[PDB]
Amino acid sequence: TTVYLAGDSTMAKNGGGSGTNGWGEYLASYLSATVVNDAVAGRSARSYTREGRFENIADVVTAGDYVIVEFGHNDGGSTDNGRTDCSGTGAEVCYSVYDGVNETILTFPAYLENAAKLFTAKGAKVILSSQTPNNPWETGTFVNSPTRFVEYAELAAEVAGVEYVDHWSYVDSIYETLGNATVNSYFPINHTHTSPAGAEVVAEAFLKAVVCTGTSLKSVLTTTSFEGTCL
Ligand SMILES: *[C@@H]1O[C@H](CO)[C@@H](O)[C@H](O)[C@H]1NC(C)=O
Numbered sequence: 523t524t525v526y527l528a529g530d531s532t533m534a535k536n537g538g539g540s541g542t543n544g545w546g547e548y549l550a551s552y553l554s555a556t557v558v559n560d561a562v563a564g565r566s567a568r569s570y571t572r573e574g575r576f577e578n579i580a581d582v583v584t585a586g587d588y589v590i591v592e593f594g595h596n597d598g599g600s601t602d603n604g605r606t607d608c609s610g611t612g613a614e615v616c617y618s619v620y621d622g623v624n625e626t627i628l629t630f631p632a633y634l635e636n637a638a639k640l641f642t643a644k645g646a647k648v649i650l651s652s653q654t655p656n657n658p659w660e661t662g663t664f665v666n667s668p669t670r671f672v673e674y675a676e677l678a679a680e681v682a683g684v685e686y687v688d689h690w691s692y693v694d695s696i697y698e699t700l701g702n703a704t705v706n707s708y709f710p711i712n713h714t715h716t717s718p719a720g721a722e723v724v725a726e727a728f729l730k731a732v733v734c735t736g737t738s739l740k741s742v743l744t745t746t747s748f749e750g751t752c753l
């Protein structure tokens with residue numbers, strides 16, 4: 523069995539550079555399944571789609587494999603940076619001339635739904651996961667400030683008939699517990715990329731979420747002992 527990962531610098535091997543790492547690098551150790559980390563720094567649901575990266579996974583996935591999809595950090599606005607999705611949750615389309623093409627730009631849920639349907643057709647088990655939080659201790663006071671993309675991932679899961687993991691909430695829960703000095707130490711570059719220790723915390727919070735939510739992936743866990751509490 524193989525688990526394919528789609529995401530951005532918070533998930534990717536080597537993170538955002540300069541010493542950081544992504545959470546997808548801290549899963550293999552706890553799964554009986556091979557992990558293929560196809561996350562890439564800087565990508566949004568739109569640009570990951572446009573770059574053919576969901577299609578790349580689709581073309582190698584085998585029946586019974588899993589695909590975990592987690593975007594949002596790069597999906598918001600600000601002229602066309604090649605990443606911003608069209609606003610909304612449905613069938614809205616936005617047109618933009620980007621890299622010499624009049625591009626048809628979809629909403630964040632449509633991109634996720636379309637990828638999910640593609641993987642389901644190939645026999646894969648798709649897990650849509652809400653984005654991780656930017657450092658919630660940046661101000662010295664804990665702030666839980668979900669982006670619109672958190673619930674949009676849940677919406678997408680429901681429309682596509684696939685599983686949802688609220689990775690956001692499990693990360694912010696353990697960050698609240700770990701506290702100000704510890705969590706600030708996980709963000710040496712900007713408030714998004716994580717140090718290796720933070721990437722591991724973030725991965726362990728995904729695994730906690732799987733145990734607590736009863737996600738299908740629990741079947742390939744080799745332990746259920748992860749820090750934090752069920753939410
Ligand atoms: C882009 O394509 C759409 C859909 O056909 C069309 O309305 C729009 O005018 C085109 N835009 C540009 C700037 O060519």
Ligand SMILES: *[C@@H]1O[C@H](CO)[C@@H](O)[C@H](O)[C@H]1NC(C)=O
Binds near residue numbers: 662663703706707
């Ligand atoms: C929070 O942690 C940062 C980094 O160690 C520290 O510089 C700041 O003073 C701490 N904030 C307070 C409110 O303790």
